[PDB]
Each structure stands twice: as C-alpha cells, then as structure tokens.
C-alpha cells in the first residue's frame, strides 16, 4: 500500500541519518527491488501479510548494510559506523525472522516451520540484494 512504502522509506531515512549518509540514491533502487520481489511472490502464490512485512524488514537491513559501506567510503569513523550498522542490521534481521516465524507457525508443522522460516529469510534476502544491486 501507499502506507507500506512510505513507512519503509521513513525508516530508511532514519537509518541513513544514523549512518550520516544521504538516503537519496538508495530509495529508488530499494523501492523498485522490493516492488519486484513482492510481485513475484504474489504471482507465485507465496505472499501473505507477514511475508510482506518481512520483506520491508529485509530491505531495511540491506539498506543499512549498503549505506554503512558508503559511510565508510565517505571517511566516517569505522568503529562508530560499523557499530551503528551492526545494531541496525541486527534489529532488522531480528524483525524479519520474527515475521518469518509467525508466517510459518500457522502454515507448517512445528518440526519443519523453523527451517522453512530460515529458508524464507535466506532466499528473500539473497533475491532482494541481487535486485537492489541490479538497480544500483
């Protein structure tokens, strides 16, 4: 929705401020990559509300890791930049996995749900990262 995209962009701008780097160039690449991933998941019948929320969390994790690299390239302090990156990335990967586990718990047996949630995160992050890099 409009609110889903705007919420993601708001959070991306927050993490950009934290890392002291301009969010501008990544907004286009991340929004386009996220849109394309969601359309693929929808077409294939893989999308649910928790999966959509998870995808925003993963996009934000990747934005933080990419923006932190640009902060290092711009000369920002390495210890502070990487500490902030790691805190932000940890927060978003934790959020993403919490959505993944909620998706899996109502749909799969207790035995396989953990592995499928882990696999969903891995596959989703790999796909988004490839899509973001293609746009960039």
Author numbering: 3 to 138
Provide text from the study.
Here we introduce Chroma, a generative model for proteins and protein complexes that can directly sample novel protein structures and sequences, and that can be conditioned to steer the generative process towards desired properties and functions. We sought to characterize the space of possible proteins parameterized by Chroma by generating a large number of unconditional samples of proteins and protein complexes (100,000 single-chain proteins and 20,000 complexes across two versions of the models, v.0 and v.1). The experimental characterization of 310 proteins shows that sampling from Chroma results in proteins that are highly expressed, fold and have favourable biophysical properties.
We reasoned that the best way to determine the plausibility of the protein space parameterized by Chroma was to draw independent samples from the model and test them experimentally. The crystal structures of two designed proteins exhibit atomistic agreement with Chroma samples (a backbone root-mean-square deviation of around 1.0 Å). Moreover, the two designs with experimentally determined crystal structures demonstrate that a non-trivial fraction of this distribution should be expected to be atomistically accurate.
